[PDB]
């Protein structure tokens, strides 16, 4: 009826939840804690001309 | 490799021991687009007569000398018609390219930070007071920090090992920065676009950054090596808009 | 009708094998003035084993870090008194009178997130000679005043009418009063530092407080007066939401003095040990 | 109505749970995002950049730049050990404070590699080769360069390319290790040792500075967060 | 079965550019003589840029304004009293005893809609030299007299076994008491304002109170009496819910007076400042 | 039955919350619609409306419909200024009471920009030229018309067309301003000066009077409802 | 189960809720708090004969 | 809406429950009551070689 | 909201209940499994494994290990009861401490059949006949081996096989049997007679050893958990 079905967190080495909204604003729903992204290119390599790892970072 | 140019508006930078350039967030300046922008007059865009490259004063690179601290805008305030634009505008936006420029020979030693700091918010002498505007920034002429704790109201408390923001001076390298290391390179470059929270502001009120020298390996040199070593920045902005014109501030 | 989401876990990466080496390739070798971080895996300084390396970075993202509830604020109020603005609690709105959050918050920059507020409410019978007496559960409510707004100069102000302000009402002995809140800004992000004045002459005041302007909470008992004196302690806790950060800043190294300013006292680096060889001799029988 | 049965921990407060809650300014009109620059993501971007180390944290050298900077001198000082200390992320004082320190110090289990890289921050003439050399534990530290040879090391001969990377690779048995690292789940020491020492030519000086930067591998990650002992108040207003 | 509703988001209008003019077309000048509101956007005095505008106009609409709860009636009333009409409170019910509320409602001539009531009903201890008993939890009885039926003289009325006239009891220590009322009137739309009489003979009662009976409302202690005294004290919140409204009217300007008539002090338009010429100087060192 | 367990917020009442409830009077028949002219669907449209502004509202005229007035004479009065004022349509006692004034002060920010429409009310035959500029915040307001000038302003030539619309901009970095201005979302402010002067033949007043309307634009938006400070009672039955 | 899944209110620069009427009565259900709709050329141009916006009020 | 409809534990000699999961995560759930499984043999017989119960235990 | 209406048993904790209930460490990331050798799956695996009886539990024995052996020995001896012991796997001394009787402990009913081997500890040279014999119940036990002889019998010949498994069937009424056992639901008792008796040659011992070992058979199962009265504490710290 207006669900969502999930995967849960489960461990590596019946894991499915569901979710309804009940609030007229986004701003009254859960929080994101299942999105996982990186960028740290951004502040770990943030230069002009690219540095390849294996060549003299000069010459 | 290390040859590099900058050609920005009627000025060039030429330089031959350039490490790299820092492209603050790997974002480059770029102009305001339609549907972040919420002034609805057109702005001026002036393009060659404020996007060039403004030359500050120099500083003496001492053997004991802790640090400098320059606060942008307020330091191109004087400058040409970025300064003067910056005046008769009430909302601003640019974004800058700074090349500090620093040779030594080979017999010489040592390694500055240059360091670009959003928002650098700083911190008074007694902790119960408030700072200056003067202790903040004087134009062109570049505030000092101190190797031991400073006193006397209003005046930044301006330690090195803290920064003047309460924070480890060691930890500054999450901020875009680069080193000058006198035997490997003599200048750096960091490109900073426009950070900020609003998409314009005014240029008067909010000093939009900060950029600190500090010499973490201080000068050295032997028998009749040069004494003299200094320092000297160059400011470029970039992608420069000005918008709502009025009756020329006065300060 | 329901609705599969696809949520992908992100590993960090595996070890690769590696062999001998003798060749021009130097990852070691580098040059840090370029102000760039140095990528040299294991796998390129010595001889590794391949490991599937099953690990998660995941209660390290920003939403797994921020979004835990904390106090901000903790505020006393009497039935009783003889003051008549002791009646009620009062307190403009930041995060910034709790050295936890704050700091936590104050490694970015700009954060713009949603909260989800609560109250802790706790009454006490304040102490005394004559103590014993029947009385009800207290209610409380707890108005929230924007800026601009009049304000209550008693508990048995008009203001208290609530017409458009919102507020709450909560009798003593539930579980706590809790509401969610969008981002109630007029930037695009809630600037935590800010590096200037209010005036455009260059003064007025300086930093945090010239931006951000909340309004306030004022919170009262609804019951009336009470024939022996108590007293109630608010406490808030903010957990935000939803939350984007941007442009991070070391953390604070030296502690706060108020809430107003970022003064500081100047303190050490770090704590010192014997020499810089020490390293203590713990195989010892 | 339904028919419905409280469980326990009904009418709680957990500190950490998500649920849905009233909005309290119903229909409100956000703000339109803005593509600020530099959106922070995850916390290990904030432990994966440099940070210069307070190595020489002697006492009497803790409120100046000197501690940030090793000290390298030329003559026969090959007996002598250049520095040397624990590997311990969160608890060393040499690194609880760094950004990978005050990063994990809000964790407290971390697995994971770490990069040490330093910086000969001397003349343009002067030369020298260094040893760099991790002890995974076990055994006391080492005190002499023969000892430090037969760890994980590295040789790292000071030219052009200024800086060299010590990789500290995760040796361990349990998958994890505390913050508040124990003798059980101690790291091992790091000590560093000259190889063939420095040599410089006339007019040049003699005393020169290394410095240590400290970051975290691409495989790095903490968990079980908890609250950060470095901050601390003794009243509201602060 | 589940359905899909569409609902659209009504922005306001974005900024088309523009250049320089020289032509015949004044978008300027005009003529108000005509009762008509000139349509000029900026881009048709100045040189604009395009701009999309994601403004919405959506916490503005009638029923986002109105449909927020207000009170509208407070009333006391004790469990023991030597007089025997304070045992109950009563009231006829108009939204016109409160300014905030009356004043909001009277920007429209006529207006319609349902409503949600909900009722706040706080009992306090009578101040008193023997304090101290172990009284119940009190509960209370709410009725609604239609205009008819026969109203109570005591606490202990037949009247109150609300046979058909609908009555709440509540029982203290728990959530409000909230129903729901349809747009109970004879008119077709509720009249805030009415320039007429009652008699045809031009005399009579002038303006409100001649078209609106909704009847009264009655509350009173179902538990008893008490050993000790006791007041309660009744506040009653009207929200407006499917809200529709015409003729729109200047907002009032004067301050009230009674809840019968329109009847005002004149007051000056608006304050003064020193001259016609005068803004402040706010740019100075 | 279903196990349930009660989140916080329960048992309360929150003024703005929008739930189903009882009716109280159910299967009640209500009266079928009427299409009564002149419905009203949003408060942005009573905000468009033109309203007489009160700007000659200086102490002695505050109860006097001279209050709405803007006197003009003919003559060398081109030294001196017309009229001027802050553009504050919540605060400024010129706008607070209009029905875009009364109108926003239940709400607590604005954006938008704002018409306001001169209407010169002299003879048929009086002749003048009017300066209208609008000054984006930043500088004290101008002294005299070479300052006025170099705003965003608007020459009306006074003619068959009686009445000329300065259609005052937003310019603002702040997508929004409050309602409740202070010096940080200031402004700015209008000034009217004499372009030529007016010229009158024989037998006509030499004084006129201006008049003006202040109304919302198309992209007008308000928002953050609040209470009205102009609306206040002692007691019930008020 | 005579449900209806409309849109929350979300800012531009997971987004539907449910709802379910339980009453007999329309006068118990929610407020529409999403219409919005408009026209003020009632109130504003309130004219029998059009006004062009770029030719004069007269004439 | 995410359901799962398994079998209740009667006797041998409307019988279908209904679960549904309302949390993030796995380490919330209920037990794992209706699990039977076993390998005796491995504490059993823990032999290299087979003994097959019918022959001598040697030989 | 929903109506709902609370049953009997509401907000009571029942310690034998499962619902759900909410995670405090949310997103934690738990420790990979490990395939660790030895992984038990049911309880009926530790009572199918044998275990040493001790059946000589006379008084002066009982800390010795001679409580685990029966003494057997050569000559005529054939009047002589080697052993017996009633069949009470959960309430006799001589099993309530196996394994069997140990896992039994903690349950309340029990059905099944049990095995009991026994081992010839003797010289290489020594050569017997032995009869075990199980006596459902109903009858005093035998006291001589012609009523032994009529019961449900092995002859066991030691040889080469040491050992040799009495398997004691499961006869009764009930399908189940308490571990409690009462006469009600008694088992029996087992008792074991030579049958031709010890021989052995010069220079060999005359006195040997038997041993016996419990287990269950591949039918057996309990039911209706309880406590164990093994274990008991009087104060907390353990
Ligand atoms: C009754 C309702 C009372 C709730 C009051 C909530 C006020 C909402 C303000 C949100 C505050 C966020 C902080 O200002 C930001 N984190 C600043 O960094
Ligand atoms: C017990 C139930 C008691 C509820 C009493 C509700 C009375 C319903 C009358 C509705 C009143 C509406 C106002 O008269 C109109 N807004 C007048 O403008």
Redesign the interface.
Same mark, same amino acid.
């Given at each position: !009826?207006?669900?969502? &079905?999930?995967?849960?967190?489960?461990? /590596?080495?019946?894991?499915?939840?569901?979710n309804? $909204?009940?609030?007229? #604003?986004? /701003?009254?729903?859960? /929080?994101?804690?299942? #999105?996982?992204?990186? %960028?740290?290119?951004?502040?770990?390599?943030? &230069?002009? %001309?690219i !540095?390849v790892?294996? @060549?003299?970072? @000069? $010459? | 490799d290390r040859v590099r140019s900058i050609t920005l508006g009627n000025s060039t930078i030429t330089t031959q021991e350039s490490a790299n350039v820092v492209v603050a967030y790997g974002r480059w300046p770029e102009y305001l687009k339609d549907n972040e922008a919420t002034a609805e007059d057109q702005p001026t865009q002036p393009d060659v007569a404020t996007c060039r490259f403004y030359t500050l004063e120099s500083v003496t690179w001492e053997r004991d000398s802790p640090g400098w601290w320059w606060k942008f805008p307020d330091a191109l305030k004087d400058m040409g018609l970025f300064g003067q634009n910056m005046y008769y505008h009430y909302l601003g936006r640019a974004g800058y390219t700074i090349h500090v420029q620093c040779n030594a020979s080979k017999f010489h030693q040592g390694c500055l930070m240059v360091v670009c700091v959003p928002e650098a918010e700083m911190g008074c002498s007694q902790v119960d007071g408030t700072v200056n505007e003067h202790s903040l920034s004087e134009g062109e002429t570049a505030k000092k920090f101190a190797s031991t704790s400073t006193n006397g109201t209003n005046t930044v408390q301006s330690i090195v090992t803290n920064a003047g923001m309460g924070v480890g001076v060691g930890n500054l390298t999450i901020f875009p920065h680069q080193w000058i290391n006198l035997r490997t390179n003599n200048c750096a470059t960091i490109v900073m676009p426009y950070i900020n929270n609003v998409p314009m502001d005014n240029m008067f009120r909010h000093h939009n950054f900060t950029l600190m020298i500090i010499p973490f390996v201080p000068l050295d040199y032997s028998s009749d090596s040069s004494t003299y070593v200094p320092i000297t920045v160059t400011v470029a902005p970039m992608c420069a808009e000005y918008n709502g014109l009025r009756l020329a501030t006065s300060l | 009708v329901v609705e599969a989401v696809e949520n992908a876990v992100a590993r960090v990466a595996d070890t690769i094998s590696s062999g001998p080496s003798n060749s021009q390739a130097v990852p070691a070798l580098t040059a840090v003035e370029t102000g760039h971080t140095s990528q040299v895996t294991p796998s390129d300084t010595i001889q590794t084993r391949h490991v599937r390396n099953y690990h998660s970075r995941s209660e390290s993202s920003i939403e797994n870090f921020l979004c835990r509830s904390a106090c901000v604020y903790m505020g006393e109020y009497h039935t009783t008194n003889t003051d008549t603005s002791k009646l009620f609690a009062s307190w403009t709105i930041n995060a910034r009178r709790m050295v936890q959050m704050r700091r936590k918050l104050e490694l970015f920059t700009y954060v713009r997130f949603d909260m989800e507020v609560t109250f802790v409410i706790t009454s006490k019978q304040d102490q005394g000679t004559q103590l014993g007496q029947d009385m009800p559960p207290l209610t409380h409510q707890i108005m929230y005043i924007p800026p601009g707004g009049p304000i209550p100069k008693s508990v048995t102000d008009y203001t208290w009418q609530t017409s458009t302000n919102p507020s709450i009402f909560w009798t003593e002995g539930n579980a706590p009063p809790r509401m969610s809140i969008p981002f109630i800004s007029i930037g695009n992000a809630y600037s935590n530092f800010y590096d200037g004045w209010s005036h455009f002459s260059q003064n007025g005041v300086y930093g945090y407080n010239t931006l951000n302007h909340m309004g306030q909470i004022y919170v009262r008992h609804v019951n009336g007066s009470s024939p022996l004196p108590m007293t109630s302690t608010v406490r808030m806790y903010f957990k935000p939401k939803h939350v984007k950060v941007w442009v991070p800043r070391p953390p604070r190294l030296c502690q706060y003095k108020n809430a107003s300013t970022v003064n500081f006292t100047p303190t050490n680096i770090t704590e010192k040990r014997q020499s810089i060889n020490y390293i203590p001799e713990t195989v010892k029988p | 109505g339904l028919p419905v049965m409280n469980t326990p921990g009904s009418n709680q407060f957990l500190t950490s749970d998500d649920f849905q809650s009233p909005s309290a300014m119903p229909q409100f009109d956000v703000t339109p995002e803005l593509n600020i620059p530099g959106e922070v993501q995850n916390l290990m971007e904030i432990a994966e950049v440099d940070s210069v180390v307070p190595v020489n944290n002697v006492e009497g050298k803790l409120d100046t730049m000197e501690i940030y900077r090793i000290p390298v001198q030329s003559g026969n000082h090959q007996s002598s050990q250049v520095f040397g200390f624990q590997v311990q992320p969160g608890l060393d004082n040499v690194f609880k404070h760094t950004l990978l320190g005050e990063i994990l110090n809000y964790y407290a289990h971390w697995s994971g590699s770490i990069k040490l890289t330093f910086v000969f921050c001397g003349s343009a003439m002067a030369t020298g080769k260094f040893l760099l050399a991790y002890a995974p534990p076990g055994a006391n530290a080492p005190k002499s360069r023969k000892d430090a040879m037969l760890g994980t090391h590295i040789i790292w001969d000071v030219g052009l390319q200024s800086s060299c990377v010590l990789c500290i690779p995760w040796i361990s048995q349990t998958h994890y290790r505390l913050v508040q690292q124990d003798e059980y789940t101690s790291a091992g020491n790091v000590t560093c040792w000259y190889q063939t020492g420095i040599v410089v030519p006339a007019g040049t000086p003699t005393s020169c500075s290394i410095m240590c930067f400290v970051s975290a591998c691409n495989d790095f990650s903490v968990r079980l967060l908890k609250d950060t002992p470095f901050i601390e108040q003794s009243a509201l207003l602060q």
């Open positions: !009826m207006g669900a969502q &079905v999930s995967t849960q967190k489960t461990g /590596a080495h019946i894991i499915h939840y569901t309804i $909204n009940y609030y007229k #604003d986004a /701003a009254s729903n859960s /929080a994101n804690r299942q #999105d996982f992204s990186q %960028d740290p290119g951004k502040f770990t390599e943030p &230069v002009k %001309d !540095m790892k294996s @060549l003299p970072a @000069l $010459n | - | - | -």
